[PDB]
Amino acid sequence: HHHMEDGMNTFDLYYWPVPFRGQLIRGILAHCGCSWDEHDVDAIEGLMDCGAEKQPVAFMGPPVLIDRERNFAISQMPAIAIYLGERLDILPATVEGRTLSAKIVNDANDVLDELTLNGGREMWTPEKWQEFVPRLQKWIRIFADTGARNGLSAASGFMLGTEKIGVADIVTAILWTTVADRFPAIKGIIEDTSPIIWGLSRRVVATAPLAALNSKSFEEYGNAYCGGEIEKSLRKVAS
Amino acid sequence: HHHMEDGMNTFDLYYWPVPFRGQLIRGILAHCGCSWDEHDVDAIEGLMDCGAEKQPVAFMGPPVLIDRERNFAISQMPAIAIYLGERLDILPATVEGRTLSAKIVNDANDVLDELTLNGGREMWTPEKWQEFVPRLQKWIRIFADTGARNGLSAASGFMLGTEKIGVADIVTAILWTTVADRFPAIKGIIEDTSPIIWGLSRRVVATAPLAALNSKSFEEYGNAYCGGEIEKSLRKVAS
């Protein structure tokens, strides 16, 4: 229930119609009960190609978020997540807690890149995948460990030991659940490696706003994850 | 002139002995007149391999920074940079300015990865390099544009239009100068693409603390940039 005095959405988001890097931002917006505009592929490619001076903020790739209330534009998913966390009051009250939240979002940003071999010409093979599994397990344990130092269990608690869901929880939950729900090998690795991260992620996305976002994303995007050709190769190795 | 009451350095930094991703953090520390401990390759590999629960904070790759005064550990270079910016009072006073500073550090983190083909098995060829040049030019212009909206010129001003050097300036200056000084093709691209980013970067690293860090890094690391085999292949294409 927050829009402008002419009824326009407070936020304007540019990100591809796949539940990938910008899904983490859509999750933060949805959790906090925000409404936002989206754009199609042609509009997103246009924004990338119009020249630095004509962009809302100079950026390389999406997501890009415009905050119409503050007349402010931001790119880089980790910068957008922490910005929204401050703006929407879902970060911890300490510099330490805010800083760990930045660490966790950057870690998430990194896992997304490693899952997709940095979105370039490199494809998965069964061999690259088997090499990667232990590293993916290590990433899962990096998340599980920060939770564990803050009292996290499968059944209760949040990532940074807070009273409520914060950015850290949202980004963690959307990262792991989105890929789990689409690639059975990865789902099995998460379940086998960290029950505590499984439980936290599944509790967070069971909340009404995120359960509704998850369903709406399936109905809009089908089974897409990233996708392009890189998705096809991940499907071959991680199903 | 800030250490602990027993004289130990306030900060403890783990990063490889190359002027690469952690150089941006060394720059922030040096600019603010801080002293910090460093570690050798065996110690860094040890910290990576000791298990999540035994790390100062769970992390994948360095840099890792321990703040002994606050008893706080942080990884992810963009999270460390912004943490230090707050701790050492060299960030803008607005959420917008802090957030753009996060964007710029993430952009820097990304340029470092693209220069080194994500630190994996992929090597440069002359062909991949020619394809990359326009993208590198685009990155340079992304930095130049944010400067330009804040009044930046070659000869004066800072990235975010501030009274003094902030994180954004330091990370920008160290990113571009370090690679320029080691790869003549890249130096020529920066000079030809954005005189304003050239001038800002060269003004910032002319300051006494950063001029001393630059020299100390050459004497400790030789001509190394990243290096490993990926450095050898970059040298072949970008000299």
**Sequence-distant (≥ 6) Cβ neighbours of residue B106 within 8 angstroms:** A76, A78, A79, A106, A109, B78
Nearest to B60 among A72, A118, A139 (CB): A139
Q: Domains in chain B, please, with CATH?
A: 1-94 (3.40.30.10), 95-239 (1.20.1050.10)
Sign of CA dihedral B70, A148, B13, B115: negative
In chain A, which residues have their Cβ closer than 8 Å to the Cβ of B70? 96
Alpha carbon of A79 to those of A65, B26, B50, B72, B190: distances in Å? 10, 22, 30, 21, 25
Phi, psi of A36 (to 5 degrees): -150, 155
β-bridge mates for residue A75, sequence order = A64
Q: Strands A36-37, A11-14: parallel, antiparallel or unpaired by DSSP? A: parallel
Which element (helix H / strand E) includes B214?
helix B208-221
Distance CA A94, CA A233 (A): 42
Nearest to B103 among A76, A86, A139 (CB): A76
A97 touches chain B (CB under 8 A): no
Asked if residues B146 and B104 have their Cβ atoms less than 8 Å apart, the reply is yes
* Structure-solving method: X-ray
Q: Is A181 exposed, middle or buried (0-12, 13-18, 19+ CB in 10 A)?
A: middle
**Sequence-distant (≥ 6) Cβ neighbours of residue A236 within 8 angstroms:** A124, A126
Closest C-alpha to A13, from A91, A88, A77: A77
Asked if residues A187 and A180 have their Cβ atoms less than 8 Å apart, the reply is yes
A74 touches chain B (CB under 8 A): yes
B95 touches chain A (CB under 8 A): yes
Distance CA B216, CA B195 (A): 27
Q: Please identify which residue in the block is written with the tokens 């800030």.
A: B2
Asked if residues B170 and B102 have their Cβ atoms less than 8 Å apart, the reply is no
Overall resolution, Å: 2.0
In chain B, which residues have their Cβ closer than 8 Å to the Cβ of A144? 52
